[PDB]
Write a protein that binds this ligand. Sequence first.
Ligand SMILES: CCCCCNCC(P(=O)(O)O)P(=O)(O)O
Ligand SMILES: CCCCCNCC(P(=O)(O)O)P(=O)(O)O
Ligand SMILES: C=C(C)CCOP(=O)(O)OP(=O)(O)O
Ligand SMILES: C=C(C)CCOP(=O)(O)OP(=O)(O)O
Ligand SMILES: [Mg+2]
Ligand SMILES: [Mg+2]
Ligand SMILES: [Mg+2]
Ligand SMILES: [Mg+2]
Ligand SMILES: [Mg+2]
Ligand SMILES: [Mg+2]
Ligand code: NA
Ligand code: NA
Lengths: 361, 361
Amino acid sequence: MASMERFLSVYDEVQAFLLDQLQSKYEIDPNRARYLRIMMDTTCLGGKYFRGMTVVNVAEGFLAVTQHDEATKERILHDACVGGWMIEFLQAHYLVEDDIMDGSVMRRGKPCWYRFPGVTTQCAINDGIILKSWTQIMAWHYFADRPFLKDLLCLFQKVDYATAVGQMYDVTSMCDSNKLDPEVAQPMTTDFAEFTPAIYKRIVKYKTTFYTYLLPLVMGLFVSEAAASVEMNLVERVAHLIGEYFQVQDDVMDCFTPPEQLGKVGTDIEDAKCSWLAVTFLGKANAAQVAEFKANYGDKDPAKVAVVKRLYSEANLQADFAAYEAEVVREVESLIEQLKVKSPTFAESVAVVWEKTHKRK
Amino acid sequence: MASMERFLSVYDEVQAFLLDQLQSKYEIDPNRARYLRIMMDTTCLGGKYFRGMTVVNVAEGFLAVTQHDEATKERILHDACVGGWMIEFLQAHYLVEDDIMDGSVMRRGKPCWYRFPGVTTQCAINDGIILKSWTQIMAWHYFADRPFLKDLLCLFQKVDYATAVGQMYDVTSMCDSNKLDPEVAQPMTTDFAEFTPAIYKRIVKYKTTFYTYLLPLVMGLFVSEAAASVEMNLVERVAHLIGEYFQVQDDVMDCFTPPEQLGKVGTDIEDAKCSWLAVTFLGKANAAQVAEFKANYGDKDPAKVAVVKRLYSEANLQADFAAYEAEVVREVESLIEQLKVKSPTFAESVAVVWEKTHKRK
Ligand SMILES: CCCCCNCC(P(=O)(O)O)P(=O)(O)O
Ligand SMILES: CCCCCNCC(P(=O)(O)O)P(=O)(O)O
Ligand SMILES: C=C(C)CCOP(=O)(O)OP(=O)(O)O
Ligand SMILES: C=C(C)CCOP(=O)(O)OP(=O)(O)O
Ligand SMILES: [Mg+2]
Ligand SMILES: [Mg+2]
Ligand SMILES: [Mg+2]
Ligand SMILES: [Mg+2]
Ligand SMILES: [Mg+2]
Ligand SMILES: [Mg+2]
Ligand code: NA
Ligand code: NA
């Protein structure tokens, strides 16, 4: 698509601004310039650009209904594109650090950054930190004199923190809360009592929905000067509900989509994740199924994973997924109708964002 | 000292604001609240608070010469204290990630955060990320309506990036630039040609001097409304020169101060660091000393480190340290005299910051 090439053109411009800055102001040499350009490319590119492109789509909606000079249109789209790359590079930061943390081997068809032979955990941790700095550099440089600067930086901060908090929920999810203790090595849960829908929705709301839905949609608004025309409590509710659905699809795929299509080898049973499949499982299983789950879940052992998969498969979790899906379709359409009151244009951009999610892979 | 207790009181207030926010807005539970309170305490407290206290000292200087109401004084000091904790928590973020990266075992008399039995690399990486978020949260909450907000956030950003860039220099310093390549495992240098004063000063300028001297001194200014009364090019030059001296002292100690006094076991010879001692060594050694250095430097082997230490010891690097020190005393006093023209009060706060550094441990 032509729009995605134009989006990528803003990325080249941004990469070129960033590296030229490191050469003229940070005394960087060409080899380290090169190593950071490849790190940037490897960690930021290759995905679908769903988050980044959403910013552009929202602003586009507003430009179709709104009087501007051509130059203002170009300005508005170029800001939406910059803003989008801010979110793509934030994501890039969290995925680098997440793959170190989740013990992961592959992503987007390639080895995780830290697993490249010339990188190692050592560099990649700092590379990830650089990725997020570059998001603030981009903001301060391209939005220097935009009336939305401060609001944009405050919202980005808040989204970044929520994400880090979510990550903390996610990584502490196989542990019993009463056992969390920096002094004592964390033993895996044996009861699985915190594997509940309420806990799962919590984990998911923070680790995924702020940065993948709330941030793109609001940034589209921010860069459009369009925030005072939508109901923000509604933007929050629809973002949190679509992104929760998006995570649930993530979780299903980790288990049941072949690595070839997923392009990232699935580690949820091994890692003992609080996934949608394990929670939904424990919500319908009889006593002996539960006991078999407990003897097997959470271990690298290739045969103990089969047992889990077959439990999941025989429990019929596609029935639960269709009830779940059908109920999300109801609330998402309902929120879309409510956004129509104040903002018909934004409602339609949410409808598009919903449509693309609901159809993914 | 009473001032350090008052500084710590602002920390309790800040910790209490942060955790209460996680409970009322982030749906956090008490066990995870507890785990983050201990993580905060363990990673932020225990040091000298040199950086944080410098902010307070600079503002104090300005309050001695400047007409204010009492309430404005209390406001100004409380901001300086908040600002100081911003720098202490930034440092805390970088040291958590640095100890993962440097392979380190101890710090400030205790095991490095990631080595606590209930933490692990997995959590600590994210804990470190949280530490830096908390610095933006503090800024946005306590400096909400201060005329310096934007300047303070832009300077903090810039300092944070410079630090991350420096870290990248530091971690890539045992590698030959022409060999840096994400695809190929990085072999240790065998020529040590990039172990030069110019390279060392570069590494050091970025990884240490921005966040440890430039940021504290400028933040003192920012919170004082006092920036337009100093020459900023001079603040940059004196900060970069004292902090370089501070790193050189760091490097000497890593080698020659007993672990008991250092409270952090020294890993510079093992890690093959571009330290001041190795550069200064290679600047005076004859041909066979150099060759012995090369056969020995950069290996965990307890006897290969002795050989390096004895080379360092027999080469007489205290002669070079005194010439170095004496020359830093000359330029630092010279910059202090130049800061006197526009700002006698700030000059004296630099003189105090210089004095404390020059006398440390
Ligand atoms: C931005 C925080 C990092 C989490 C992003 N998503 C990673 C997902 P992955 O892409 O690893 O499947 P997870 O939640 O780990 O299943
Ligand atoms: C803030 C960037 C992290 C570097 C801070 N200083 C760590 C020093 P350490 O305290 O590890 O001796 P290094 O430079 O590693 O000798
Ligand atoms: C990180 C997660 C949750 C995997 C889902 O795909 P992405 O979120 O990588 O989507 P794109 O980067 O391709 O838009
Ligand atoms: C991190 C380094 C370079 C070690 C020097 O001491 P600190 O910088 O830890 O000083 P304080 O935190 O005690 O002020
Ligand atoms: Mg994860
Ligand atoms: Mg993951
Ligand atoms: Mg997943
Ligand atoms: Mg280091
Ligand atoms: Mg270190
Ligand atoms: Mg050191
Ligand atoms: Na960062
Ligand atoms: Na952070």
